[PDB]
Symmetry: D2
Subunit: 414 residues, 4 copies
C-alpha cells in the first residue's frame, strides 16, 4: 500500500474519508475495536462537543465531501430540525453515531485488528497483527490516541475506583455509595460533578471535588485566542526554542484542565438552588495535591496537601473518580524501528512541522500527541482536517485539498 493507518478515528478516520476520492492513494486502516466508538464512557445525557460541527471529519478541508456532518443529517432525515435547533455543537452520541456512519461507508477499514509490532525491511514498513496478518507500505500514520493517565499515588490501587474514561458504566454503583470524590479539573470532572450534584438530595451521598488547580479554569474560547488555533501560529510556535515550548505546554490551563464557562456558572446556579433547602453536603477544594491513596474495608483514605497554604489534610470516601487527564506513551509495537524515529531532548517524538517523526521528513506521521510541537492544535477536532490535508500533501507531491497559510487577523511572528 501507499500508507497504513494504525488506530482509526477521529483523526485517522478523517484521513480515511479524505483519501477515499483520491485514487492516486490507496491506504488501509486497522482498528482494534470491532467498530468505531468514541469516549463512550463520557456519554452523559445532554453532553455535547466543545467544538462546532464544522470540526467534523472533512468539512474544514472540503465542504463538498459526502461524509460531512450536514450530509449525514440529510441522510438520516434530521437536517431540518437540526436547522431549527440552531446549535453549533452536536451531542456526543450524535457525533459518535455520525463517525460510525462514516466508517461503515468506507471500504478501507479493517476492524478487530490490533497491531503487534512494526519494523523496517527493504525500505518499506512491515506491520504485524494480533491474528498474524501482515501489511506493508512505504508510509504509516499513527493515530493510536491517548490512553488514560493515572497518578502514581493510585498505581497499584484496588477497590472500585474509576478513571472518568468509564463513568457511565459505573454510575450504576457510584450513586449507591455514601460518599463520592472526584480528583482533578477539566470538562469531564465538572460534567461529572454537575451530574452527581443534580441528584445529591435523592441518593444522599457526600460529594467532594478536589483539584490541584488554583482556580476552576474556563475554556479559553474567546475569538482572539481561538486564532491561536491557526496555521500561522503553528508555524510560529514550532520554530521556538523547545524548552520555551515545553514550558508553554506545562503552563497551559484551558486545554486539558479547562471547563466550559457556561458549565461553571450552571454548577454555581445548581449549588445556589440546592442550598435554599438547607446545607448541601458538598466540598470544592483547589490548590490541593493528591499524595497518598489506600483502600480499607470498602472506603478510600486519600491524603491531600494544600500546596499554596502549605498544610495537609485527608478525606475518606467510598467512591473515587479520577478525572485525571490522558497521556501518550511510546507504543510497544515501534520498538524494532526506534532508531528510525527522531526524539527531542526530553524523551518524546520531535514531530516536524509536517507531522513526521522519523529520519525521512515524510516517512511515519503522527496524529495527536504533539502539544510540545503544535500546541493546542494537536488534539483539536478543528485542526484534524488541516493536519490530514498536509499529510496528504506529502504522500502525493501535490496539494489535493487547499491548505490555508493564514487565517487570522493578528500577527504572531515578526
Amino acid at each position: 500500500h501507499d500508507f497504513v493507518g494504525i488506530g482509526l478515528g477521529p483523526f485517522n478516520l478523517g484521513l480515511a474519508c479524505l483519501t477515499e476520492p483520491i485514487d492516486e492513494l490507496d491506504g488501509i486502516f486497522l482498528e482494534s475495536k470491532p467498530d468505531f466508538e468514541w469516549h463512550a464512557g463520557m456519554f452523559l445525557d445532554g453532553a455535547h462537543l466543545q467544538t462546532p460541527f464544522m470540526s467534523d471529519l472533512v468539512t474544514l478541508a472540503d465542504p463538498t465531501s459526502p461524509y460531512s456532518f450536514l450530509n449525514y443529517l440529510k441522510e438520516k432525515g434530521r437536517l431540518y430540525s437540526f436547522y431549527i435547533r440552531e446549535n453549533f455543537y452536536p451531542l456526543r452520541v450524535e457525533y459518535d453515531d455520525y463517525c460510525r456512519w462514516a466508517a461503515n461507508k468506507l471500504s478501507s477499514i479493517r476492524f478487530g485488528t490490533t497491531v503487534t509490532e512494526v519494523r523496517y525491511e527493504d525500505d518499506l514498513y512491515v506491520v504485524t497483527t494480533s491474528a498474524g496478518d501482515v501489511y506493508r507500505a512505504r508510509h504509516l500514520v499513527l493515530g493510536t490516541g491517548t490512553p488514560p493517565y493515572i497518578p502514581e499515588a493510585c498505581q497499584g490501587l484496588d477497590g472500585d475506583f474509576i478513571h472518568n474514561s468509564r463513568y457511565v458504566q459505573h454510575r450504576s454503583e457510584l450513586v449507591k455509595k455514601e460518599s463520592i470524590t472526584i480528583v482533578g479539573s477539566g470538562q469531564s470532572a465538572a460534567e461529572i460533578y454537575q451530574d452527581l450534584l443534580g441528584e445529591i438530595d435523592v441518593h444522599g451521598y457526600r460529594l467532594n471535588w478536589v483539584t490541584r488547580s488554583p482556580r476552576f479554569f474556563p475554556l479559553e474560547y474567546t475569538k482572539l485566542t481561538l486564532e491561536m488555533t491557526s496555521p500561522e501560529y503553528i508555524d510560529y510556535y514550532r520554530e521556538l526554542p523547545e524548552a520555551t515550548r515545553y514550558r508553554l505546554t506545562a503552563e497551559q490551563k484551558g486545554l486539558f484542565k479547562g471547563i466550559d464557562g457556561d458549565l461553571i456558572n450552571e454548577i454555581f446556579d445548581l449549588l445556589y438552588q440546592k442550598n435554599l433547602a438547607g446545607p448541601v453536603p458538598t466540598r470544592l477544594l483547589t490548590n490541593s495535591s493528591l499524595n497518598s491513596a489506600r483502600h480499607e474495608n470498602g472506603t478510600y483514605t486519600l491524603a491531600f496537601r494544600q500546596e499554596e497554604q502549605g498544610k495537609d489534610f485527608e478525606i475518606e470516601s467510598q467512591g473515587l473518580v479520577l478525572a485525571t487527564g490522558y497521556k501518550y506513551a511510546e507504543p510497544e509495537f515501534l520498538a524494532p524501528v526506534k532508531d528510525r524515529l527522531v526524539y527531542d531532548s526530553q524523551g518524546n517524538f520531535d514531530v516536524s512541522r509536517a507531522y513526521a517523526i522519523d529520519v525521512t521528513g515524510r516517512g511515519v506521521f503522527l496524529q495527536n500527541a504533539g502539544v510540545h510541537t503544535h500546541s493546542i492544535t494537536s488534539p483539536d477536532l478543528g485542526m484534524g482536517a488541516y493536519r490530514n490535508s498536509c499529510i496528504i500533501r506529502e504522500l502525493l507531491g501535490t496539494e489535493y485539498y487547499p491548505v490555508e497559510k493564514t487565517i487570522a487577523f493578528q500577527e504572531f511572528s515578526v
Copy 2:
C-alpha cells in the same frame, strides 16, 4: 431549439434552482434576468446588516450539502472558512450573502443577464417567451421567479419630492441626514434597521426622528423553535387543504412574517434610546396604531395626515424626509397576458397555485416561486424553504425525485 424549462427572473429562489439543476444533465433550461449581474436588496446593505435565517438556508445545502455551490464551499474557496468557523455565527452578513450568490451565479452557464421578458405565449404545446431585444426562447415549462416589487400606499401615489421606499435607503442616506426632520412609516425589520441607523447619529446631525406604524405593537419575528416547525412540509399540506376563506384570513392575520422585527434589534433600539436619553431629551417619536391616510409635498417638506385607528383620532406630522418601509407586494406581470386563459385563479383574482407549486391548467406546466402566502403560508418567501420547493419543482420536471424531499420534519402534528 427548445429547452426543458425557462426561468424568468434570477432571485435567490431561481438561482438556487439553477445551482440544483446544473448537475442534472437530464434537465437543462435557461434563466433570464433583468439586471446585468446578480444583485440582492442592495438598498438595505446597512453596516453590519445580516440575514434573518441561518446560513444553511443558502441556495443548495438543505437539499444537498455536498453541492459545490454551498455557502461553506464559497468560504473555503475565498480563504475565509476558518475565520467564519471562529466567528461562530449562523447568520451571514447581507453583503456577504450578496457576494456569495454572485459568485455562484457566475459559476453557471445557464443564466442570461440583462434580458427582460416582454411576452409569453402558448403555441404548438410549448411556451414562447420573448425578450425586450426580440430574442425568442421556447420550452415545455416555465418557472417564474420575478420576486415582489416594492409596495407604495395609495396615499403616496403621485407624490412629489425626494421620498424613498426603504429599498433605496443606502443610496439616499447622505441626503437624509442633512435634513432637520425624518419620518419612517411602517413596521418590519427594514424599518427598525433604518430607525436604529438614524437614531445612532441623531446627536451629530440634529434631525427629528419619527417612526409611525399601523401595527398595534412592534411585533417580534416569531422565531421560537416550536413555531419554526410551522415552516415544514407537514404544515404546507395541512394548510393547503383548508378552505380558501380560512387561508386568506390567516395570511391577513399574519404579524411577524412581513411586519416583524428581530427581537434583539427591538431591545438594542430601546437600549440606545436609554443611552441617548441620559444626555437630555432626544427628539424622537414612536407611534403605534397609526395609518397613513394622505400626504402632500410643498416647501421641500411633507405634511402627512395620520389616523390613530383604535383611538379614533386624527393627527399629522411635518417632516422634510420621508422613508416608506411599507414592504413589498406581488403584482401579476402583464407579460402573462397572452396566456391568462392558461392560468389558475382563485376568488380574489390571485394565482391558485397548487401543492406542487403549479399555476396552470396542467398542474405541472408553469411554476411560481414566491408570492404564495395564501397557499403555502410563511413558506413562500422563506430562504429556508427555497431548496425544498426547488426539490419539488425538479421532482415534476423530471419523473423522479433527484434530491430527497422530506415527508415530515417536526415533532408536532398539525392535521388529525
Copy 3:
C-alpha cells in the same frame, strides 16, 4: 380601621409593607391560610419568576423600604451569593420564602381568618369572620386573587385528574401511569410538559399536550411592548370604548397563554435529544378544543375538535392534567353590598382608573381581576407597587410614594 384588606396575596401583602411606616394610616389584613403561601404546587425544581426581582413587594415604589428583596437577602446572609449569581429572576421557593419573611415581620395581618360577609351600615363597611369576629372600616381592599378555572366540560368528573394548581403534590402518582395528557398552554403547561418529558424514558408513559391556541405563543417581553406595562398605557387603555377593550382583552394571546421563549426552545432541544435514541411517545397538538371527557376504568376518554380543520378526534389517557387558566368570580361575601358596586355592559366590575369598584369611586378597591380595564398591568407583579401607591394616594388623599405619570419612550395616545 381606615381600610380592611381581604386576602393576602402578593398585591395585598405589598400594600401591607408599604403602609406599615405610614402612621396616619391604620389598616389590617385578613387571610384564610394560617400563613402566607404562594402558588405552591407549581414549585418545580429550578422554577423561577417571569419578572425581575425589583417586581417584589416594595422596591418599585420605595427602594429604601426594609421589606425589599435585597434586604431579605442581606439578612439571610445571601446577598453576595446572589450578587455573583447575576440572575434577575428569583426562584419560586425563594420568592415564596421572601414574602413569608416580610409577612411575619408585620403587625397588621390576621392569619386563619376567612371572611364570610360584607355589609354597609352608617357609612362603614362591616367585615365578619367565619369565626364570628367583626371588623369594620371606611375602605376595603380586595386581594382575593383569581381561583383556578376548569372548562366546564370537566365539571363533576370522577378520576384523579388535577388542575396544575396541584401538580407537585400529585407528581409521584402521575409518573406511575402509562399515559398522561396536558390540556391548555401557557407557562406552567410547558413547565409541566418539560418536567414529564426528560423522564419519559425512565417511566413508561405516553405524553400528550393539547391546546386550543393556534401557536405555542411566546411570552413576548421585547422591551418596546414591555412599555405597554406603563402608567401612560393604562391612562390610554382605560379611556377606550369598552367594546374595543373587551376585544383587546380577548384577542391578544400571551398574557395568560404565553410560554417563556427560552422554555419553548429547550423543549424542542430536549425533543431533539430524546429522538436520537428512537421515536419518542409524545404528541403536540394545536387548534383543538376539549368538548367532552369521561372516566371509566382508570382511563380518561377525551373528545377533541380541531376547530381550524373542522374534524374531531379522541385521546385515551390514564392521566389528565388541566393546565387551563385561572378566572375571577365575584365572591359571595359581597352579596349584601352588591348595589354599592359598579358593573359594566358584560356584568363585571367597572374598575376605575384609581382601581375602585364602588359608587364613591374611592371606597372599595380591587387588586387583580382588571384586565378589561387595565390590560397587562393588573395581574402583573411589576405593577403591584404602582397600583398600591395609587390606592395609598386615594386613602390618604396625598401621594406618600411618588407615582410616575410617564415612563416609556413611545406615545400611545395622540
Copy 4:
C-alpha cells in the same frame, strides 16, 4: 475642630464611606477632595461604555440595601427606575454611574470640595492635616482614598509630542483621528475599548491602527462564577495570612485583574474585523508578546522599538499617534512624609496593610482604601468590595459592627 476621622480623596470608596457614615450619629468625619466636584474616570467616557460590575456594586447596597443613597433609589428620584427595570441590564453606563455619584455627594454635608491636602503630621495624639489654602483639620483617624495615578513606562518618561495615557482619550480623540497612524500600547479593558472605537471608523479617517501588548494572549476578564467567589471575605482571610513572597508572586502573575478584557468585547472586536475585511484589507495590526523598550519623537512621528520577548526578535513601528493604555500604579503621596515614622511597611517597601485595612502603628489609626492588591488580592480596587471594606473600617472606628460583616459567602473552601 476635632473630628473622628478625616477622609482624604473622594473617589467611589471614600464617597461610599461618606454615605455609610451619614446615618451614624456616633461618627462624624469630614472628607477633603481636590476637584471642585466629584468626577470619575471621565477620560474614558466612550459612548455606550458601562461598568464591569453589576449595579449592586454601588456605594451602599452591599452593606445596606435600604440606604437612601442606593443606585435604585437614585433611579427612583430621577424618574428612571421603571425603564431601567425594562432595560434589564445589570451594568450601569459609565456616565450613569458618574452622575449617580455626584448626586450622592451633593446630598451629603460632610464633603469639602476644592481642597488639596498638602501635609500630615502627628501632634498631641492627633493627626493634623493641612490644605493648600492653609486650613487645618484635626482627627485621630485618617482614611486614605487618593486612588492610583496613571502609570507611564520608563521608555516614555521625558517623551516629546502629543502622546496620551488612555485616561485622557476622550479629550484627545478628535485630534487622534486626524492622523495617519495610531498605535495603542498595553492590553486591558480600556485598551480594547479604544481599539474598537477607532477600528469602527477606520474606513472614514483612513489611519493605520496598531495594537501592541506584552501579554501573550488577549486575556478575558475572569468572571466565571466559581472564580468570582475569590473576591470574598474568606479568601482574603486566607490570602492575607500567606507568606509575603507567595502573595507578591500571585499579585505579579495576575492576568485578568488589570490586563483582562471583557470576553464580549473581544468577540465583537473579531466580528468587527470580520465585517471590515469583507470590503478589502484593513490597515491594522494586532501584536502580542511585545514589550516597548524605546520611544522617540521627531517631526510629529513616534518611532517605537519593540521586542517580541518570546520569539527573541526586535522590530520598530512608526506612528504619529501614541496612546499608552499602560494602567495605573499607586505611589506614596508626599503629604505623608512627616508621619512616615508611624506607618507600617513590608519587605519590598510598600504598605503592610492590615486585614482591618490599617497601615499605622496602632493597627487602627490610618486606613487605606485601594492600593492593596499585595494584601487583599482582587478585592482592593473592586467596586463589589469597598462596601465591605467600608463596613470593616467603620467597625474599627466605632467599637461595634454597625453594618453586618459577612464572614462566609462562597460554596468552596480556600483554606484547610
